[PDB]
Design a protein around this ligand. Structure first.
Ligand SMILES: Cc1cc2nc3c(=O)[nH]c(=O)nc-3n(C[C@H](O)[C@H](O)[C@H](O)COP(=O)(O)OP(=O)(O)OC[C@H]3O[C@@H](n4cnc5c(N)ncnc54)[C@H](O)[C@@H]3O)c2cc1C
Ligand SMILES: Cc1cc2nc3c(=O)[nH]c(=O)nc-3n(C[C@H](O)[C@H](O)[C@H](O)COP(=O)(O)OP(=O)(O)OC[C@H]3O[C@@H](n4cnc5c(N)ncnc54)[C@H](O)[C@@H]3O)c2cc1C
Ligand SMILES: Cc1ncc(C[n+]2c([C@@](C)(O)OO)sc(CCOP(=O)(O)OP(=O)(O)O)c2C)c(N)n1
Ligand SMILES: Cc1ncc(C[n+]2c([C@@](C)(O)OO)sc(CCOP(=O)(O)OP(=O)(O)O)c2C)c(N)n1
Ligand SMILES: COc1nc(C)nc(NC(=O)NS(=O)(=O)c2ccccc2OCCCl)n1
Ligand SMILES: COc1nc(C)nc(NC(=O)NS(=O)(=O)c2ccccc2OCCCl)n1
Ligand SMILES: [Mg+2]
Ligand SMILES: [Mg+2]
Ligand SMILES: [Mg+2]
Ligand SMILES: [Mg+2]
Lengths: 582, 582
């Protein structure tokens, strides 16, 4: 039973109605940066005792923190910005949340309703700008609609395939006095009538049947399984099917497990891509068959019966055409299939030990490998040490690039929502603000931003946020002085011709530039640099043991390449397994 | 004080709420064609005792009748159609009403809300289709919004620059029971804050000043003056400025008046186009400077100070850049200027008799002329006889083409809203259904559809409507067996090479085809054909004296050309004054 701060017959500002609408959704944290068009909302936030605001230093930091909050908790992330330049600073995070299916509610202040369309001060038609990069958006045109629209926004953001919803609120609506009606029904008849139903036994029986008739089955799990950790684990016990995971699915099935093929795709392991290449049954659970994973679509799982379980009917058959399809929640499909598998256990007699042994041969012939040069620090090794010293229990956020791939390859995530990374859009600058949101959502967890030097500097201003909010955010900065992933493609395909990928100072070519330690010092954050591989273990331990925030500048040789690599649009026969920039 | 047919606490269907919403707007006549998605609305219409439905035989006839109703009365015309093929049949009339600024409210049934977007039975996304050809449109998503949206539709259609508004009503909303709230405020804050204010004396004084300083002033009046007949007439008394009128403005100033220059433009009189060509002050009242009137914009009124009074700020300076501009209702501007002119009468001493005499010389050297060949009926002469026998008091609707021009040139409209013609879009088939709407709105008036044989056959099915509704609609069919206006351009610019402009039967080339008398006979409408000019006067008199509907098939030589003609994009020096298809 909710307790309002206003009498049921007492008129309050629309901004107070909006804040209470957030309170009634269970919101405890927002990421709000004030401006003229949203001042009323910020005043109403100070009047709330249950909602805390984390003031970022850039609205892109605000939306990315809301993402990290959401990705690490399963709850919707809430960011708030003013009109115009505040709203446009949210755009990268909105697109990021849509491509990765992250539940997000973004609220933007807007000019007064009568000023809309007149090129008013700090006016941006943000509803038009963001229509194609949000799951849905709204322009509130009356204070009476605030309870309903906020409720619909949270429902749309969190139900079905999750995504971002933007709510544009004109300033005059924030000031207008009204008595809210919290009993209004939502106006989503089409959306609600097309929400997937529980999976029928008809479809679930056929899948278990295809499993018993197959000899080379491969699980292909992705971001849709983040809430099915227990069900997927039980499913693997009952079937013994090896698990290949996408970038977004990492941790749904434990990485340090015997049946784990780890990541597949462009930078997936040789044995995971091998398994899919030669499988006869592909169980595609919570995946969208993106080009990083499949390469050439015609060659992807070319001799496999493809079972695709997805909550979005539009994804089924979008790129790869399945044989069997189930449109529904993969959590429920796993539960139904687990019952059938448990009952018919002695009848089915499932044993894929011959297939698993064929894969474990590839696993030992072509494992993930890295080279140690003198006393230089291998980035892959630094992440393995972090995994060891944190016991694989840390929440990991990343930027985008080589360090992102190494953070995916060389850390054994035991649970979903430890892995917070921008996969579909791949937005640099995500790692630091995402760690802010993850730490606020999980204040007792070890939170480490494994960042690159290009990605880290893009939103370096959020170090001030970390200090002011006294968040124990650790930064493991893999510093190669380059835009590494673009540098790698220069080496492979452009004869190592450098086109603006060096991030240091060419006048002092052998100096680490910039000095990231002084960025941390500017914000009162203790920091250190490590260069010798012998010193790396104690340096990471110091970062972990030092209470509060900490930045560890880990210098790495830039000639490292992420391996293996299947070229874009290629097949398994095109996989690159050796070579670097030396 | 309105009297509802339901108790204020009694729930009724949304369809009954919609019909009462029409009743509360003063609606007495709708033009509604039933279908599955609008059956509920039609059931609710039979329960209304104050609203009469005129069932057309085609929804295009329905919307064009709503136009004729509106154009002839100043009230909004209301048409109703079912979803899908009913809605798409409204499209030509919606575009027609937008280009001519006709107040119109179109209501379309729609599939149930949950079916929208699923390619349901008879589903058309009519709101998307018609967004660019309506002033505004709505998709009603809750039964509670019906009172507000209907009120906003009528307000938007009739206020400012009038235009069509479409309201799309899903079938489930028509069936849902609710208690309407008729006190809801409209949500048009931007539109209402930008509605033009009464004209300031600052701007009105400057215009009267420019009048006293000019020696060759020309009034240039259009469709925006249809409600300023008295004010414009008083303005002409106080200034003695000659009046040139657009196609849409005909009748605002009486045609059979001494100061009337009649129509200007592509087929305007030589003296009207002369006056504008050599004017030093152009009073552009309620006009939009379209290409038919101006020709080459740089040459149009090239040596004139241009005063443009328009209620739409977007029209001021759109094609021609004025010197002085007033954004407001021309009715109020005329009233304000009339006060100034009346007070400073002896001070201003306005006399343009020198300019008027220079124009009356052109008026006598180059008047409107037509040629009589043997006993063949000149179409121009037929319209002059109709003018005489009706004493210039008939409501005239037309199709589009040569007959439309002759109906504009050779009938002296004494008041606005006697002239109902499609000017901006120029849609053939307008004349017959427009006469239906004009007769329903003016049941004691003489209503004559001056139609062409191509235009008349397009909506010939509305003859059944005329008989069933027992409307005294007269049809003066100027039958030249051709698509005359396109034929004229073939003669002038394509060496008379015929490209599908002959409407008769080439097997029986000298037979009148089709036999329009049998179309009228099929619908129990008395009819006659006249071919000899000597018989024309009695035939028209018989048409007028015979009570009820009547069709007069007036056979005309097809080689007639509308004269004069300024070629498209030409100047006054390019005017064509002689020649035909002989
Ligand atoms: C530099 C870089 C390199 C990359 N290389 C790789 C790579 O080598 N390998 C790799 O895997 N990725 C790689 N990616 C990531 C990549 O581009 C995509 O983000 C990722 O492959 C897609 O993950 P997904 O298939 O699990 O679909 P997601 O983006 O996670 O979407 C989830 C899918 O499951 C469905 N779903 C959601 N919820 C449910 C539910 N409850 N039940 C059923 N279905 C549900 C959704 O409708 C959607 O179809 C890389 C990214 C970057 C930036
Ligand atoms: C075959 C054919 C030939 C044609 N040839 C000619 C021709 O030779 N000559 C000719 O004149 N037309 C001709 N037309 C008609 C033509 O294409 C245009 O419809 C017409 O010229 C435009 O009329 P208008 O300038 O009065 O503007 P309208 O279409 O009547 O619009 C009214 C204008 O006044 C403004 N307004 C409305 N209400 C008010 C108010 N209360 N106060 C102030 N302003 C207001 C509106 O914003 C708008 O700018 C022809 C049409 C056809 C089909
Ligand atoms: C906002 C933004 N701008 C540019 C991008 C294009 N990319 C990349 C890519 C793979 O998306 O190529 O398309 S990765 C990358 C360079 C990463 O520099 P680093 O942070 O130092 O990490 P590393 O360990 O050295 O590799 C660039 C420039 C991007 N994704 N986001
Ligand atoms: C729905 C529609 N289709 C085609 C049209 C193109 N036009 C015309 C025009 C000027 O708009 O040329 O653009 S006029 C015209 C022929 C008129 O045949 P009539 O009715 O017999 O009259 P008349 O006395 O003989 O001239 C055509 C074909 C049109 N406007 N509407
Ligand atoms: C320096 O100007 C300033 N500074 C600050 C800190 N606040 C405000 N607020 C404000 O202008 N409110 S407003 O009247 O409703 C308003 C009117 C018109 C257009 C926009 C608009 O607001 C939306 C953007 Cl501020 N203005
Ligand atoms: C021959 O079928 C028929 N005939 C007639 C005369 N009426 C109806 N009515 C009807 O189908 N109503 S509906 O259930 O709500 C409905 C459901 C789905 C899609 C559309 C739809 O209606 C909108 C278009 Cl009819 N159907
Ligand atoms: Mg080592
Ligand atoms: Mg780098
Ligand atoms: Mg004669
Ligand atoms: Mg004709």
């Amino acid at each position: 039973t909710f307790i309002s701060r206003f009498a049921p017959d007492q008129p309050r500002k629309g901004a107070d109605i909006l804040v209470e609408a957030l309170e009634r959704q269970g919101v405890e944290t927002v990421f709000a940066y004030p401006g003229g068009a949203s001042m009323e909302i910020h005043q109403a936030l100070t009047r709330s005792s249950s909602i805390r605001n984390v003031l970022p230093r850039h609205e892109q930091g605000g939306v990315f923190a809301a993402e990290g909050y959401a990705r690490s908790s399963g709850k919707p992330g809430i960011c708030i910005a003013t009109s115009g330049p505040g709203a446009t600073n949210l755009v990268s995070g909105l697109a990021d949340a849509l491509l990765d299916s992250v539940p997000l509610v973004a609220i933007t202040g807007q000019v007064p309703r009568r000023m809309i369309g007149t090129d008013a001060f700090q006016e941006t038609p943000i509803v038009e700008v963001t229509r194609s990069i949000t799951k849905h958006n709204y322009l509130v045109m009356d204070v009476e609609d605030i309870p309903r629209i906020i409720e619909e926004a949270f429902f749309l953001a969190t139900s079905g395939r999750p995504g971002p919803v933007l709510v544009d609120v004109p300033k005059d609506i924030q000031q207008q006095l009204a008595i809210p009606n919290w009993e209004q029904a939502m106006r989503l008849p089409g959306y609600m009538s097309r929400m997937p139903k529980p999976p029928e036994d008809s479809h679930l029986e056929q899948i278990v049947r295809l499993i018993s008739e197959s000899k080379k089955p491969v699980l292909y799990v992705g971001g849709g399984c983040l809430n099915s950790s227990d069900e997927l684990g039980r499913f693997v016990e009952l079937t013994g099917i090896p698990v290949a995971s996408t970038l977004m699915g990492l941790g749904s099935y434990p990485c340090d497990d015997e049946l784990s093929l780890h990541m597949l795709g462009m930078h997936g392991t040789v044995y995971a891509n091998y398994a899919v290449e030669h499988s006869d049954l592909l169980l595609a659970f919570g995946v969208r068959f993106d080009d990083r994973v499949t390469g050439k679509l015609e060659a992807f799982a070319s001799r496999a019966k493809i079972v695709h379980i997805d909550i979005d009917s539009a994804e089924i058959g979008k790129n790869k055409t399945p044989h069997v399809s189930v449109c529904g929640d993969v959590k429920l499909a796993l539960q139904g299939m687990n019952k059938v598998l448990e009952n018919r256990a002695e009848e089915l007699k499932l044993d894929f030990g011959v297939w698993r042994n064929e894969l474990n041969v590839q696993k030992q012939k072509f494992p993930l490998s890295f080279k140690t040069f003198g006393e230089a620090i291998p980035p892959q090794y630094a992440i393995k040490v972090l995994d060891e010293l944190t016991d694989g229990k840390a929440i990991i956020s990343t930027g985008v690039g080589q360090h992102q791939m190494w953070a995916a390859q060389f850390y054994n995530y035991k649970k979903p929502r430890q892995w917070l990374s921008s996969g579909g859009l791949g937005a640099m600058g995500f790692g630091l603000p995402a760690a802010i949101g993850a730490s606020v959502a999980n204040p007792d967890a070890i939170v480490v931003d494994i960042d690159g030097d290009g990605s880290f500097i893009m939103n370096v201003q959020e170090l001030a946020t970390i200090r002011v909010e006294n968040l124990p955010v650790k930064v493991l900065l893999l510093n190669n002085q380059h835009l590494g992933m673009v540098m790698q493609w220069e080496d492979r395909f452009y004869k190592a011709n450098r086109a603006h990928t060096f991030l240091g100072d060419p006048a002092q070519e052998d100096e680490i530039f910039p000095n990231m330690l002084l960025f941390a010092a500017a914000c009162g954050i203790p920091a250190a640099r490590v260069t010798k591989k012998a010193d790396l273990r104690e340096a990471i331990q110091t970062m972990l043991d030092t209470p509060g925030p900490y930045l560890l500048d880990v210098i790495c040789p830039h000639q490292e390449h992420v391996l293996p690599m299947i070229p874009s649009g290629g097949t398994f026969n095109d996989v690159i397994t050796e070579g670097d920039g030396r």
